Amino acid sequence: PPPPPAPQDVEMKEEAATGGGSTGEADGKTAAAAAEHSQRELDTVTLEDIKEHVKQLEKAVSGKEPRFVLRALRMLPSTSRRLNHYVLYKAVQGFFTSNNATRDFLLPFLEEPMDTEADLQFRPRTGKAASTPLLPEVEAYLQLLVVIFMMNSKRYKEAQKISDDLMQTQNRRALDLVAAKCYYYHARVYEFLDKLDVVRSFLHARLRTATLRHDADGQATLLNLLLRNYLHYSLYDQAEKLVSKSVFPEQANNNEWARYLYYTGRIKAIQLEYSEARRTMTNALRKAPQHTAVGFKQTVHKLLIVVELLLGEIPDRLQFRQPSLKRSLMPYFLLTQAVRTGNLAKFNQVLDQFGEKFQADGTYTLIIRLRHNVIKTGVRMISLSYSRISLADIAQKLQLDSPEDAEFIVAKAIRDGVIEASINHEKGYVQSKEMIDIYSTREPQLAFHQRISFCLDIHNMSVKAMRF
């Protein structure tokens, strides 16, 4: 009863801003987005995700959600007296007896701000009234009398889709900002039990309705939902992105775009790619927003640089290593050691030692080409090393035992185009060369057009950012 005043304070600090302030920031505002309380409220949703939200236990049971959802009314200027009601109900938790009125009694509590009066006209108060109670209910998924209620609370959020689609006005720059979060929690609670089936068409038509009339933070986030949907399950509709690539917003949330490029980097990694996939993995890597969230870059980075492992030109990756990730990369450290080593028995004994964590990865694409990566590491090293090597030297240095499969190796390496190396054809016996004096002057200034044209692009972008 002395700690629940801290949810009592932060609860009023949240819906003061949200209800009164963003309702006044919805009345006449939003020239581009003057709803700064929307980003303030998403900051407070991250604040309720740091802390306990409001009333999970808090030394009592079920105090705020029966309390504050009453009597908003939006009327004559003595509705700060309804705020005074909200404030002076707080003798119940400290003084009186707390009673259980959440997760069961919420079904008319959500209908209370509609059945008081014709409160107001805008939907962000309705999204408030169905989000700010019900998002404090989702992160307790103990699957007993709590997850069927997340299910029904997000059925009320599907009614919030209905009252997002037929609400009379660019309130989507608040409701899609909240709906990004809560539709991720939709996908979470729906897939804590089974794969979601008609929620796919929910998501399809929800992407459809956000097409042009209000195309603001909805398309990219629902596309992240759709992408991770097609990622977690069988892989049939990546041709949909190959035919309907409409994936380019303002890239607003500045981390949504980062992890979006990460997820589609995993896509192009699993389709087939080295180059474009590793460069968008690199751009998402350097577009890591901060390290203010403990060890969340780490597992996702273990799966990020799988393609760089598949390059073969990677050293040990240890600068990323969280020490709490060490006990999980007990396979992965020896795996990049098996990348640095050319042993074959160790190449399959790391697999024979860690196939279960390789299934935890669940990417066969790595081991279906990692032997080929070992022989390409060999050919890159030794073909960069010597001018006129023999195929027998490298062959029976890497246990090939015959000339003709070394010929097929050198031939498919010419076909893969690393070095000039040809064969002094009598019985093999490579006659070859390196390549210095290739070119060095007009060829840099070919790329310097892209250098400085990229620089002047960022000049004009800083100009259009200086405009703000």
């Binding site: 991720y184 969340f296 780490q298 597992t299 050293p315 640095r340």
Partner: protein, 38 residues
């Protein structure tokens, strides 16, 4: 932030990356025994 699925999850340390790069070359006599091999 880490709002993704991932929430599911110098003494020699400086010279250690080179050490694992040194983990494939005669870790530390046959160098010196090669003198008398010829």
């Amino acid at each position: 932030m880490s709002e993704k699925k991932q929430p599911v999850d110098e003494d020699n340390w400086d010279d250690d990356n080179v050490e694992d790069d040194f983990s494939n070359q005669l870790r530390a006599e046959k160098h010196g025994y090669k003198m008398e091999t010829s």
